[PDB]
Structure 1
């Protein structure tokens, strides 16, 4: 009879997607990626400032 909007109603969003509980528990919306450091080649740096 009435349309209930998800992402504002907890029960309707949980019913629509069972992953709501696991997503909230694991906090998958804020994930820290692996700290990998790669240095660009000298050619890229030279061509970035090439005038």
Structure 2
């Protein structure tokens, strides 16, 4: 049993065996949708650009 070690990060079939979840992963997801709310306190900006 297990004559050879197969790397799941390279062997898709072995990864499917180990993880019965990789078939539904969807790594790339729109999370910064709608608009981007620039959030930077004026106090924080002043101290950042201080001295």
Query: What's the TM-score bracket when you normalise by the shorter of the two chains?
Result: 0.7 to 0.9
State the TM-score, normalizing by the size of structure 2. 0.74
Q: In the alignment, what sits opposite 1:50? A: 50
Q: Number of residues paired by the alignment?
A: 47
Question: Which is helix-richer, 1 or 2?
Answer: 1
Runs of 5+ in structure 1 lacking a partner? none
Q: How far apart are residue 14 of structure 1 and its match? A: 0.1
State the TM-score, normalizing by the size of structure 1. 0.74
Q: How far apart are residue 34 of structure 1 and its match? A: 3.6
Runs of 5+ in structure 2 lacking a partner? none
After superposing on structure 2, the runs of 4+ consecutive aligned residues of structure 1 that deviate more than 6 Å are: none
Q: In the alignment, what sits opposite 1:33? A: 31
Provide the aligned C-alpha RMSD in A: 1.5
Q: In the alignment, what sits opposite 2:12? A: 10
2:23 & 2:40 partners in 1: Cα distance?
41
